[PDB]
UniProtKB/Swiss-Prot annotation, chain A:
It comes from Francisella tularensis subsp. tularensis (strain SCHU S4 / Schu 4). It comes from the Bacteria. The keyword Cell inner membrane does not apply. It is an enzyme of class 5 (isomerase). The gene is tpiA. This is Triosephosphate isomerase. NCBIfam families: tim. GO terms for molecular function: triose-phosphate isomerase activity. Involved in the gluconeogenesis. Catalyzes stereospecifically the conversion of dihydroxyacetone phosphate (DHAP) to D-glyceraldehyde-3-phosphate (G3P). It catalyses: D-glyceraldehyde 3-phosphate = dihydroxyacetone phosphate.
Length: 247, 243
């Protein structure tokens, strides 16, 4: 179940999305997903087959009621969302989403909807040797209070912020190094699940650099960002993971 | 007169609980009505509510379209067909650290559009009982009344939420002199502008107090929370505020 998903982010409109969902609709035992903006979710699930998983890029761990401008897990399931994004760097950097905020939202849907826990270290963290410290911290509340049965449903979406926006390139060794380390943090709890948990890379992925990244031994797919906005591109990234996983 | 009765469905309801709400609200004169559903339910409300009833979004951002998850834009506000937008609600200011500097950048984004912004203001129990009410209220409109022209400050709605009032309820005449004060602020900008600006009241606008609160001299409309979800009590308040 090679998990290839696309973060659409706040980009697009009603027309550019319907033109894409037709283009997105175009494929062996793999897993493709899409996270559109909140206002377009019911349209997107209506323009795609259920084989494609659809989710939202953020909810709120509050129960329904006096909470303005927010969406809940119960309002998440009513739309028909299969997955859910948790802990994105931009919600963490531009809105100060803490590790406590991540675990609260995760606990809402953990026993239901496959969660997508996003993690990543900053550029100052990697240069100051805070690499392994922060990634263990961003995993503390998850691995300390949940079980193998709940851990298996969690999908880690590693996105290295030290390479996003900073322009600093990411060699395929340090990509494999971090994915190998993230898996080792789970291996400290259970290795049979750690070796069969989907840790998808959420850095800069394009159709040009598609292979040699998914081909790495510790990559279970990608959390594609800007490249996922185009069908001829996203479906090209689709077909790459399809062929390399078969042979 | 003219009343702007608006319903803010904060974080409530489902598709089957909104269809019955929309069709069930559809039963007014030259008196504007608006509805604030969730972003995951906006087009469902557009598909079930009449044209003359406004449908706005609860929260957007000020950043342009780009690498921003979990947010909604002013374009997505316009492309989705929203006629209104709620700005500066006390819950987003309390629980999610929404600042006046955020309120202004989001308001300034949509003021040049056909969308009527609904900027919300209000002080808590600490502020008014300590006399700070005049300060913590002029602060929140300070940025807005600064850079916005008298023409820009038109079609801007001031929703005053009495956050200071659980069992205790804001007194009736204790609201009129409050709505009188905030208009005397824009009276320093322009008396005429402060004479036409619609200022609604963001409190427990329940059915058994429809006329009285809306009959206060400086109450230009209403932004209801819990009773907007029950269309029977929602319709009656618009019906008891038809004139």
């Amino acid at each position: 179940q090679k998990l290839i998903m696309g973060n659409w982010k706040m980009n697009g409109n009603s027309t550019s999305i319907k033109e894409l969902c037709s283009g997105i609709s175009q494929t062996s035992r793999v897993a493709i997903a899409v996270f559109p903006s909140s206002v377009y979710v019911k349209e997107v699930i209506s323009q795609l087959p259920e084989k494609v998983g659809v989710g939202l890029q953020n909810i709120t761990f509050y129960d329904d009621g006096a909470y303005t401008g927010e969406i809940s897990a119960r309002m998440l399931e009513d739309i028909g969302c299969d997955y859910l994004l948790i802990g994105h760097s931009e919600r963490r950097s531009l809105f100060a989403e803490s590790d406590e905020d991540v675990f609260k939202k995760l606990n809402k849907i953990i026993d239901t909807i496959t969660p997508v826990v996003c993690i990543g270290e900053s550029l100052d963290d990697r240069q100051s040797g805070k690499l392994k410290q922060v990634l263990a911290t961003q995993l503390s509340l998850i691995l300390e209070n949940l079980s193998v049965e709940q851990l298996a449903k969690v999908v880690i979406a590693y996105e290295p912020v030290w390479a996003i926006g900073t322009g600093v390139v990411a060699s395929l060794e340090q990509i494999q190094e971090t994915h190998q380390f993230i898996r080792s943090l789970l291996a400290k709890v259970d290795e049979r699940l750690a070796k069969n948990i989907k840790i998808v890379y959420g850095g800069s992925l394009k159709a040009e650099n598609a292979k040699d990244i998914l081909s790495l031994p510790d990559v279970d797919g990608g959390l594609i960002g800007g490249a996922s906005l185009k069908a001829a591109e996203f479906n090209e990234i689709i077909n790459q993971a399809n062929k390399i996983c078969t042979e």
